[PDB]
Design a protein around this motif. Sequence first.
Motif, mmCIF file in Angstrom:
data_model
loop_
_atom_site.group_PDB
_atom_site.id
_atom_site.type_symbol
_atom_site.label_atom_id
_atom_site.label_comp_id
_atom_site.label_asym_id
_atom_site.label_seq_id
_atom_site.Cartn_x
_atom_site.Cartn_y
_atom_site.Cartn_z
ATOM 1 N N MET C 12 45.071 102.955 49.705
ATOM 2 C CA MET C 12 44.827 104.074 48.802
ATOM 3 C C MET C 12 43.901 103.673 47.667
ATOM 4 S SD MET C 12 46.059 106.692 50.096
ATOM 5 C CE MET C 12 45.597 105.882 51.638
ATOM 6 N N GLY C 13 43.990 102.442 47.185
ATOM 7 C CA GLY C 13 42.988 101.875 46.303
ATOM 8 C C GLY C 13 41.596 101.969 46.912
ATOM 9 N N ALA C 14 41.382 101.427 48.107
ATOM 10 C CA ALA C 14 40.053 101.452 48.706
ATOM 11 C C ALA C 14 39.569 102.881 48.932
ATOM 12 C CB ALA C 14 40.059 100.672 50.012
ATOM 13 N N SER C 15 40.432 103.743 49.450
ATOM 14 C CA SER C 15 40.105 105.143 49.622
ATOM 15 C C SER C 15 39.718 105.786 48.302
ATOM 16 C CB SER C 15 41.279 105.869 50.242
ATOM 17 O OG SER C 15 40.937 107.227 50.407
ATOM 18 N N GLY C 89 45.051 100.478 41.180
ATOM 19 C CA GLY C 89 44.530 100.630 39.833
ATOM 20 C C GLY C 89 43.038 100.459 39.790
ATOM 21 N N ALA C 90 42.509 99.470 40.492
ATOM 22 C CA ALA C 90 41.072 99.312 40.619
ATOM 23 C C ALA C 90 40.447 100.520 41.296
ATOM 24 C CB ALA C 90 40.803 98.030 41.399
ATOM 25 N N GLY C 91 41.050 100.984 42.375
ATOM 26 C CA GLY C 91 40.520 102.097 43.116
ATOM 27 C C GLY C 91 40.419 103.340 42.262
ATOM 28 N N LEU C 92 41.503 103.745 41.615
ATOM 29 C CA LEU C 92 41.485 104.897 40.722
ATOM 30 C C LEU C 92 40.573 104.665 39.526
ATOM 31 C CD1 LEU C 92 45.253 105.778 40.698
ATOM 32 C CD2 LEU C 92 43.465 107.039 41.842
ATOM 33 N N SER C 93 40.544 103.454 38.993
ATOM 34 C CA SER C 93 39.750 103.143 37.824
ATOM 35 C C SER C 93 38.277 103.345 38.079
ATOM 36 C CB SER C 93 39.994 101.727 37.366
ATOM 37 O OG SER C 93 39.125 101.432 36.306
ATOM 38 N N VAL C 94 37.716 102.808 39.159
ATOM 39 C CA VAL C 94 36.324 103.127 39.462
ATOM 40 C C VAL C 94 36.213 104.549 39.954
ATOM 41 C CG1 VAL C 94 36.210 102.333 41.864
ATOM 42 C CG2 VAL C 94 34.175 102.380 40.473
#
Lengths: 348, 150, 150, 150, 150, 150, 150, 150, 150, 84, 203, 41, 39, 120
Positions: C12-15, C89-94
């Motif tokens: 889900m991060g990567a998505s 968190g990284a995924g949503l952050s970017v």
Amino acid sequence: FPELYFNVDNGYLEGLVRGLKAGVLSQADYLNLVQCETLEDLKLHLQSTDYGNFLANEASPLTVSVIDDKLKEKMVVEFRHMRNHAYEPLASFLDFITYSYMIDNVILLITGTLHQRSIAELVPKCHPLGSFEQMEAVNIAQTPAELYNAILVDTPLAAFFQDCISEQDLDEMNIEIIRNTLYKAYLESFYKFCTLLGGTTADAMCPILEFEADRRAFIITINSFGTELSKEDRAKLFPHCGRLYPEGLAQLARADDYEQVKNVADYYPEYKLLFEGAGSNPGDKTLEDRFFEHEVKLNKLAFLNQFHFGVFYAFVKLKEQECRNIVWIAECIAQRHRAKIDNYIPIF
Amino acid sequence: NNPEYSSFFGVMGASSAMVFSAMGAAYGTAKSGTGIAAMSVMRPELIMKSIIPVVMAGIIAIYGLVVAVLIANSLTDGITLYRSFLQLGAGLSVGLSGLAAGFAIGIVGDAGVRGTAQQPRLFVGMILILIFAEVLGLYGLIVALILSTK
Amino acid sequence: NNPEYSSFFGVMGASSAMVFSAMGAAYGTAKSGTGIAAMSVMRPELIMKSIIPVVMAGIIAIYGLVVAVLIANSLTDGITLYRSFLQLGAGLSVGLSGLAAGFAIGIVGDAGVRGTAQQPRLFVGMILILIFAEVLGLYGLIVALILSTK
Amino acid sequence: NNPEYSSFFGVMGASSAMVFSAMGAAYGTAKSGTGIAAMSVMRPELIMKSIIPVVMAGIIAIYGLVVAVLIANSLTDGITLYRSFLQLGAGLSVGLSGLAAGFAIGIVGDAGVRGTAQQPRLFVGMILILIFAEVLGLYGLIVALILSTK
Amino acid sequence: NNPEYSSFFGVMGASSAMVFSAMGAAYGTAKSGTGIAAMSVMRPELIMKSIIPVVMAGIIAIYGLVVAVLIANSLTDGITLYRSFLQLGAGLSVGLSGLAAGFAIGIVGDAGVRGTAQQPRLFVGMILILIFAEVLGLYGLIVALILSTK
Amino acid sequence: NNPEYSSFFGVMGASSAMVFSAMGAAYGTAKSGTGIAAMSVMRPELIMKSIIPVVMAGIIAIYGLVVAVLIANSLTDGITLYRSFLQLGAGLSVGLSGLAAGFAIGIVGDAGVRGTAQQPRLFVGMILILIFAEVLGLYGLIVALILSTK
Amino acid sequence: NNPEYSSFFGVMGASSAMVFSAMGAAYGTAKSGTGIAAMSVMRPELIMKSIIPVVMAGIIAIYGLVVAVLIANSLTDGITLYRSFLQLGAGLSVGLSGLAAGFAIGIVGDAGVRGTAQQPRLFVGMILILIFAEVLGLYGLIVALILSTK
Amino acid sequence: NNPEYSSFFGVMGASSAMVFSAMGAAYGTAKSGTGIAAMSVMRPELIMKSIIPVVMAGIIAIYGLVVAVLIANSLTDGITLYRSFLQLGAGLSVGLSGLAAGFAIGIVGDAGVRGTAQQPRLFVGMILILIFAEVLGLYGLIVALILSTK
Amino acid sequence: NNPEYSSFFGVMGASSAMVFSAMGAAYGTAKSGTGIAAMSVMRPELIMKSIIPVVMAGIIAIYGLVVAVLIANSLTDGITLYRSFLQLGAGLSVGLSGLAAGFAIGIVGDAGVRGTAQQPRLFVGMILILIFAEVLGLYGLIVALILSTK
Amino acid sequence: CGPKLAACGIVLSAWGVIMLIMLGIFFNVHSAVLIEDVPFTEKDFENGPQNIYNLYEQVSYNCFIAAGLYLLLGGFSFCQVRLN
Amino acid sequence: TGLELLYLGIFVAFWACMIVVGICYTIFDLGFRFDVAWFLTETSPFMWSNLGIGLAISLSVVGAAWGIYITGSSIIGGGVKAPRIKTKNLVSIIFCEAVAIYGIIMAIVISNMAEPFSATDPKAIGHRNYHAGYSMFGAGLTVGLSNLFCGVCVGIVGSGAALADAQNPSLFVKILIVEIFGSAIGLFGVIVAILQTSRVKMG
Amino acid sequence: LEYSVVFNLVLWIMTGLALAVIITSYNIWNMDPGYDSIIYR
Amino acid sequence: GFFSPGIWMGLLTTLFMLFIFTYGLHMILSLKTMDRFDD
Amino acid sequence: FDFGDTMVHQAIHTIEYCLGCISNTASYLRLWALSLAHAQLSEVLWTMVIHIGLHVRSLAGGLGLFFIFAAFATLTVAILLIMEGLSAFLHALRLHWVEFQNKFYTGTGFKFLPFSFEHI
């Protein structure tokens, strides 16, 4: 979609205005009127239909100018009635009909004020469908700048001016440029309103309002050729709603002869048939007569639904055309010029 | 051993890859096809040239197909759950990115076609902007290839 | 041992890195692409300069691609749940920051292109306005790079 | 061995293949059949040529029917939960891709037919754009055939 | 034997077969009737030719009834959970297909009769578009028989 | 024996019988009242004849009261869920029927009053059309009485 | 035996009794006061007589107060759930009935007051219709007293 | 003895007592204050009289304060759910009744000031109408004082 | 002794006190600034006076800061769940009361600034209105200081 | 008929024959890829390949027969394209 | 606008929770919760029955109410300019009342088939009792919602006939055919609801 | 025990209060300030 | 769990009759009055 | 000349080349993409159609196979030979117009127009 809400507030007014729509002169009624020989007969024929007693309590030496006034008197009483009885969704829509008359009334007010005339003398000349509730503009009347501020305070029109015409513009522009510029802001605003009233209202109203936007563009073009208006001033007045807007509106603004205007109408088969259908030669229907004929053929499509506001706008424009028709019949009879009596538009 | 539900997320991978991509390409084709139809009226010449956004929107369906097929042919009863989450991640990474790209192609195709009616020089600019729209499907494909084979 | 669902928050991060960045780049491209097309009629010469908002919208999808790839490279079945939350968190952050940067690039692009055609001086300003939008994708990336490597 | 509830997902596949393609083909027929009616008043000759959007809308419901029958023949009283999800996937993947295709056929059909009434040269472009819409149902059918037969 | 609640989903199948077909046949009849009646003032002879969209909306009500009778007569307290789900599927399949068909029948019925009374040559085309609306009900029926009889 | 909460549903029955009937009567009085006001300015003599849809909207509140009292007298601490759900069924059957009938009386009142102002012949018809809507209230009350006494 | 939690529903009785009655009386006062103010520019002599709608809105809040206080003065620790749900149903039954009565008072007050300034004969009609509005608050009170005293 | 979590409902009481009263007084001050400012354009002298709807809106905020203080001073670690629910009820009853009063104060303060601008006789009616809006806060207060001290 | 998943409520209090007060101050600035800008066009000299509604909105943020800092220094690991709920109460009570003051400030600021330019007398009246908005923040501070130190 | 139908029948005749004869060959050589086209049954795995080989002959005949209908369509259409 | 954005806001927030909850109970290995078998057993059969009965009336009456006010408000409006409207067009109201009558026929039948159990364990309640509860629900829901739709339809097309008759007296007789097809929908909503009820017995 | 009771009390009270805040906040956020004599200037 | 019998049945009633109340309140909040009257 | 415009043009070109070395490098995946689609479509269009004529007997299968194959030919033409052809055609043009040509072909100039009677 609309039936979830429409009859909750409008079901009575729909049935009322459809009742008034049964109360129209058919082709068979006009084919009685044009046979008669004097205004006394015209009265006796109209007396048989919804116009009954419109010339009661009035002078025996009838004049076409009295027939004109008493035909409009019926129409404006019927409209003011429907506007008093309507709830805010319809009533805001009925107000959008009245702006098309209040604009012309404001043109009188500005015209008289620019000539220093008291507006109280213009009041009896204002169209009854555009009479104001707030009157401090009328009462004060001192200067064009004072009237312009009083318009913004008093009048529903205030929003249209702010989008297109400042006080300094009113001091310099000709009143006919003002008329069409206010009208540009109006038609686009009323079309936007009808797109926001989605479904059956939008689908009944947009064919008409898109045609009125094209109709202004065509007519303003062919009328501008003999005039001081630049191609930029034409572009400034063409309404952006109509089928011409993506290109033909700019092509008209470039155009400076009738053939170049027909070269726009050739891209749109309705308009190609309107221009082909009128050379405006001796004994022909004119270009203008075809626009009025077509506007009736569009207004006749409003009643082919059940639950939308398109009937109220189309009704007003059809009874307006009924007044124009019966006045035109009355002129041809009164002046004995029967050769053009057939030029009424067969509303229904 | 591996959880019984595991292949459900892999299936939603394949399904999302095709479904959201077909929604993206449908929007792209609907809006641009409308713009072509409205533009054609006074432009018989541009009708064929203007198909660019419509066919390009179709690509997003194919990126959706690529991932959807790539996931679907990789499913099994034994699937390790981790592989199913990779396949969901992939199927959304293409599918919703294709939805994004299809939105951009729809809006750009409509506007670009109408603007090209008004000014034929825009034809090059339209192609270039549609590339910056279309690549959003392609980036979604890249991530979905990486995930579906990690 | 690490719970078998732990990879879900990673994918889900990567998505989210990809998808929400593509949504931002799509909106930034769709609004600016409408602006270009509607501008072209009055100032045909400005098309090639006016692509810059579109290019910056495209860059936001590249920020999402980068993080979605970095996340994907770091996934494994045995991933400790801590690292998978970092990847979300990284995924949503970017991804959502790029959505925000893309929203700004869309609005600024459409206003900026239509303004520039009436007055060329605006260009020097609107490129700097667009820099101050596009840097939100960069901050979202910086946070996502930090988070996805703790 | 297999949950009694297992067939529920596979039944929702068979259902959703037909349901969402019926919605797609209905909207495709409704939107374009409104346009055909509005057009026919001006151009009585174009009625038989203008039916094609409606024919393609019918074809989307056929892709629905194909998968719906293929799944409903494949279902059984003890179906392995894996195959039940694969069938849900097939059903949604044709069904919602059919919906998307139906949206495109609807919009393109209405715009295309009205535009054709004003410009007979549009007919060629309209058919091509309609195939690029209708094929989205076929791409959904491809994935649905794969998943239902995997 | 079977689970205690088993018959509930099959009952919802019988209800959904009717309810969504009453929604579809209602909208299809209501929208068509508004068209027929409003039209008829302009062309009082065309009511009989114009009833056909309402008869099509009645036909998709029959489809909902036929399936709902078949489900209701197949039901019993002794019903296995498998056939209780097949019946739920048949019920949603016919019900929402009849809904889709009815939505289309209403739109094309109304636009069709309104067009026809201006231009009587539309009638032959109107029948064909209505067949392609009503046949979605027939594909709903086909699937719903193939499920509920299994 | 019976559950600790068992009486709650029957209490909500008593409440709903009053509350939904008050909502229906309120709307019915508000619309008719507005009608009366905007009629009376033109035809002051018709007020005393035109209050009819208001008293009838008042009677739809009475139908709710009758059931609300009859439920409330029937309550006890030990009430079996059977009697408590019969009372909730009664609560809806009067309550929402009163809400429905009240809306028809409100709208038919507002039409009927503003119609009668222009056409004295309507005054019989308006009351026939309103008596049909009041009987819709009886079709709530009658079953709610039957349920409460079961 | 008496459970914990139980006083909550009885408290939400005493709340709802007051809250929804105050909302009814607030709306009833707000519309009526708009009516009086917008009327009284033309007919100042009608200010005092036109207060009656506002007074009857005030009475709806008093019915809310009476029930809320009656419930509050009969809450107790360890109350059985029976009396506590009765207190809930009482508090809703006045509160929401008074809400409905408030909408009727508001609409009738505004239409009746602005109408009465054009036509003095409306006043007797307005009072009768306001009684048929205001009594809905009394019906909410009668039911609430009944329930709250079982 | 008594549960943890017990203080939560009483704290939502103190919160609702203040929050909804401040929302009420804010609406009342907002709507009244915009009215006063707009009025002063025509009338230079009426400001210090026309403030009074803002002062009565200010009183609603004090009712919320009084109850919120009484609640906050009553709470302790050991508090029984019974006193806590009573404190929730109090805070909701003053809170939402003070909101209802504030809604009415805003509307009748604004209308009353605008009418008073054109017609000075209205000021007496405006004060009376406003007392009948302000007293709704006082009824909210009375119930909340009873409940929080029961 | 004390549970975990417990300091969370007191932390959401610390955040809410600042977040909702910033939202209150933001709306209170955004409207007021639009007012000051639109006003300044004709009366430039008024700016250094008409800033007051913005300064008042700035004080609403400061009320949020004071409670958010107070809670943020009052927290500790394993804080008794009772004090954690009180701090949640404080954090909503200043936060949302500040938001209410912010709405009032924003409205009366935008009206009162415009009004002051058309009516130079209004400025004193406008401050006396704004004091009754800004004090809603102070009432929210009062209760929040009580609760957070209770 | 008209020239349109005759031109259709010519193109269909050509492509139909070309493909169906290639299939008839691929069936007669018993090529392994073709199995999915053959209408075999569970009993066709009994004894040996003789059963499946008989089906390859039957299916090859289906294609030769169908190609014969495309040859007949050809001859008809090559007359009609000249006659219309 | 406002209430549509509130209904949509609740609706999206609800499904945004349900996607997340359905994922959570799958991935955390919590399929032993989300026990739909528990929901469909411990929810009393009398609740499903009495929602069915209550909706069988009330939704039929809601459809007949719109039926009445949609045709009625047009009857009144046309009647001003065409007094002939106020008798002949009442048949469309009679068919809206018939849609409510179909409600009450069906709901009295279902009501007069309910009886008390004297048991509270799902094994002791047993399949017959559950099947009565669920059948009376689905039947009562099917007549209720089918009459809801039928009554709105007959309303709509009754305004159909009335606004057309106001302009030409002959049209009503022919337009009346659509009201019959509208009315059949409510009757289908009875026939199936009888069948859905026809085999039940509680005890 | 009673965790479903605490949870539903908290969830539905906080849903009700969240809606009554959000709805009230929306109504106050989006009032027409109606300064008609000056709104056009 | 997050639910129990009296709660789940309580919600399937309450989150039903609150839908019914909102349909009621939608029609009542849709109430309007005319801004004008006849002469 | 302007140093400002020189930076704008050279930056745009440099950025398009540098970002192109990601996007245009990936762009050729279009080939795989459409190829897969073509192959799938062809297999489905065979499988859903031809098998109806594959009856267990010579005559009964061969008679149906004539009409079934004509439907198969019609669909494979319209979908593949026409539309997916037109897809590949237009995609390959794009690959030329940008990913190939942008390295070297400026593509700016007047078309030469010979004056001739052939324009009659």
